[PDB]
Amino acid sequence: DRVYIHPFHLVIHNEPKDPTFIPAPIQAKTSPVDEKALQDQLVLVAAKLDTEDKLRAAMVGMLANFLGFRIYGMHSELWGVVHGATVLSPTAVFGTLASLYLGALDHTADRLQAILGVLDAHKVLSALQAVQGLLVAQGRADSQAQLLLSTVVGVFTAPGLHLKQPFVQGLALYTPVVLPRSLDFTELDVAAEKIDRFMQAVTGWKTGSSLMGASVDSTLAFNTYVHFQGKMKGFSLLAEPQEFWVDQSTSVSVPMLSGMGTFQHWSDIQDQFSVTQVPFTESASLLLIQPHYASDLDKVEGLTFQQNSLNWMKKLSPRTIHLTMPQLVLQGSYDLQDLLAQAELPAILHTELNLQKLSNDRIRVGEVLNSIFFELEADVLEVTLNRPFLFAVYDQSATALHFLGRVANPLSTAHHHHHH
Amino acid sequence: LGNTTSSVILTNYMDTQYYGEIGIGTPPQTFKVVFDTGSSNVWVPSSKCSRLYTACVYHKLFDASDSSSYKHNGTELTLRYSTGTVSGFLSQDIITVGGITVTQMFGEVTEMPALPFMLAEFDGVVGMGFIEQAIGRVTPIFDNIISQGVLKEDVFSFYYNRDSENSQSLGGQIVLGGSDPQHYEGNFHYINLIKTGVWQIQMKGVSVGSSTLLCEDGCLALVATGASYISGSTSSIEKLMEALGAKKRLFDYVVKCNEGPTLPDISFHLGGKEYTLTSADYVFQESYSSKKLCTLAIHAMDIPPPTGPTWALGATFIRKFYTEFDRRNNRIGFALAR
Ligand SMILES: *[C@@H]1O[C@H](CO)[C@@H](O[C@@H]2O[C@H](CO)[C@@H](O[C@@H]3O[C@H](CO)[C@@H](O)[C@H](O[C@H]4O[C@H](CO)[C@@H](O)[C@H](O)[C@@H]4O[C@@H]4O[C@H](CO)[C@@H](O)[C@H](O)[C@H]4NC(C)=O)[C@@H]3O)[C@H](O)[C@H]2NC(C)=O)[C@H](O)[C@H]1NC(C)=O
Ligand SMILES: *[C@@H]1O[C@H](CO[C@@H]2O[C@@H](C)[C@@H](O)[C@@H](O)[C@@H]2O)[C@@H](O[C@@H]2O[C@H](CO)[C@@H](O)[C@H](O)[C@H]2NC(C)=O)[C@H](O)[C@H]1NC(C)=O
């Protein structure tokens, strides 16, 4: 119904200079990012998409899912759940590597091209903007914004590093808001403070740079900051909070969103987990995976996200459900560079890398930060998420997973910005 | 002298991927493979495939070093499909297909695009076509099996089952050396190939209802067991879907699920005989609701010359009609599957 089944066809066809600039110092006064204006900008992009654009958008949606499941698996294997929650954005992770691909030449370009799983960076980045447009354009018939998705890209450069203008203008095809700033890397702990301070000013989001544990010769940080706000259709904030059981000996009282209606459901008895689809809009929904026994979460993740497939939402069927779950306000980050460096991969963002279309000057990548601010908000079989669960945000119209998540502890904490 | 037939049991995934097992090497390394009459190359993912390729990491890889019968070749091989391309190098080893062991040249694939192969339950492809179609003019596996002279007849046949019609039972069956009368009723209607080198026959016309909408002056029909759907030219399929009242929804052609069961019969005129599919044969009736859209098991594939332009009769057709591919008499036999 909501998942694409590909019909296979195995018949063989058998067929002068770049302007540069030193970015403005990070200390310099910048006006806050207008989130409402950025949403409006994406909604117009959506409204001007032809059917061929929507096909190319759906293809990068599927490409992003495959890479997203893989890199989620790497996070889960190497670090597990870091102090309560893991939130990864398949689309953002794909966008980060597509953005670096635009600046890459030769071996670095070939390796990035391979892991993205597909030549024209401009077309890929444009398609990825369309995917985000197709999401936020939904629920705009009424004056309420059911879906908000803001992306801000920070490009922090050492003194003497000149960004090429075509690269920066190229990133705008995907992310309109790109903030290149010059930043001193001689003291990495001071460099991290300045980035976090600058990003606090322009967005108001709680961020934590990993730049302390970088190379002392680092000249470049490429940080992606995402804010998602999702209002679940027919859900209200219960006045009285309820206990969330982190383990058999630990509970935390948290505010709970409660809604009753017809939601798609499937209780798998063999693999031992229940799936529930709570819609935001017509095409966009929140998927909620719940182990039948709380100790099986790793096993359930192994049979769902780790399979790198959407077969676990194939058998979904309508059902009358009363859904109670925590009002999620998750702010966390991880270093993509560090994750890839510690995973079972060849080197991509090592010292010998080629990003000469980014700059002619020496590039040493200190971090590639992916930071997510994830918010669920308000407007018989009882499904109660008062024990650890997995979640995902899926849009049918672009066959696109926007977010994958594991919640062991629903509480907000600065330790979601802890880096190994 | 040769009196042996061999039966390979196939797994049916979503009525789109009918795959069995083959062994490569000594001892055998097992791979899930689709058996395609539309192509002639054998290929599986290689251990030498970079970990960067997600599609390699999530499929079985062939390790040449763990095979005592492996013989090096290393000649580059590029297999170009509609959207994506797989590439690698030729290797020789003993392949176990059915209960028959045969020394075979196959592709070790070192480059796999995520799309479409991350949607593939199968690892590799076994080409059941002619050497004329084989990239790098590599001897196809069925030619090398005929050379052994162990088969009762120089024929192989295909049974594909409906995914809904049967649950927790036989997905499909390939027979090497004959046909299994348990899976077809009556006798085979045989049709001669236009020319050897392709499993392609003449088609007199394609009828929607009683009227002949398409292929009025005659056209070509490739029988491609590895193709999920029935495919035609973009030109032909746009006309067919106009006549059915089907609309394009992203990649799929869809109708409202309630209108599905009243869609007209589609008839393919082959060897002066009508091969008819009802709406139940080419519509995936997931629902019968007037609010839900149901997918048609038909799409557009513009196959280039010299093989195309041509229709391709895939699993949608074979599910209805048990098909026997006869290399001795260069003909195709069709009979009602049961
Ligand atoms: C999949 O796709 C690949 C890549 O495109 C194809 O590979 C190509 O196949 C071509 C064959 O169609 C190859 O073309 C040949 O290249 C030869 C040089 O390497 C050349 O000798 C050939 O030229 C003769 O044949 C042509 C007919 O196609 C004539 O136009 C031409 O005049 C030549 O004719 C001969 O002339 C000499 C002397 O003048 C005479 O003595 C002969 O008697 C003449 N013979 C004939 C028959 O007229 C030709 O250009 C091409 O090299 C190759 N490309 C690569 C990169 O390898 C695959 O075929 C294709 N496979 C499938 C299964 O589809
Ligand atoms: C890779 O193999 C091809 C094909 O080899 C032939 O078929 C194999 C199945 C096996 O039975 C071999 O013994 C056969 O020779 C080689 O291509 C052949 O090259 C020779 C030149 O020496 C030529 O006479 C043949 O006509 C060629 N055959 C074809 C189909 O092109 C090729 O040389 C091998 N490559 C390497 C590096 O070993």
Author numbering:
A (entry chain A): 1 to 15, 29 to 131, 142 to 402, 418 to 458
B (entry chain B): 3 to 340
What does the literature reporting this entry say, word for word?
An inactive human renin variant (D226A) was also prepared from HEK293 cells for crystallizing the encounter complex of renin and AGT. The crystal structure of the AGT–renin complex shows that the N-terminal tail of AGT is docked in the substrate-binding pocket of renin. The total surface area buried in the interface between AGT and renin is more than 2100 Å2; interactions between the N-terminal peptide and the renin active site account for about 50% of the buried surface, whereas interactions between the bodies of AGT and renin account for the rest. The Asp38 of renin is hydrogen-bonded to the carbonyl oxygen of the scissile bond and to a water molecule that is also within hydrogen-bond distance to the other mutated aspartic acid. The N-flap of renin in the renin–AGT complex is in a relatively open conformation with the tip of the flap shifted by about 5 Å when compared with that seen in the renin–peptide complex. The substantial interactions between the bodies of the two molecules are mainly hydrophobic. Most unexpectedly, we have found that the N terminus of AGT emerges from the renin active cleft and pokes into a surface cavity surrounded by helix H, sheet B, and helix A of AGT. This cavity corresponds to the hormone-binding pocket seen in two other serpins, thyroxine-binding globulin (TBG) and cortisol-binding globulin (CBG). The entire helix H (residues 330–336) is unwound, with the shift of residues 333–337 opening up the pocket to accommodate the N-terminal tail and with Asn331 and Asn334 shifting to form key hydrogen bonds with the body of renin. AGT appears to have adopted a “tail-in-mouth” mechanism for interacting with renin, where insertion of its N terminus into the hormone-binding pocket helps to stabilize a new conformation that forms a complementary surface on AGT for renin binding.
Human blood pressure is mainly controlled by the renin–angiotensin system, which consists of several key components, including renin, angiotensinogen (AGT),3 angiotensin-converting enzyme (ACE), and angiotensin receptors. Renin is a highly specific aspartic protease that cleaves AGT between Leu10 and Val11 to release the N-terminal angiotensin I peptide. Cleavage of AGT by renin is the rate-limiting step of the renin–angiotensin system. To address these questions, here we have solved high-resolution crystal structures of human glycosylated AGT, its encounter complex with renin, AGT cleaved in the reactive center loop, and the spent AGT from which the N-terminal angiotensin peptide has been removed by renin.
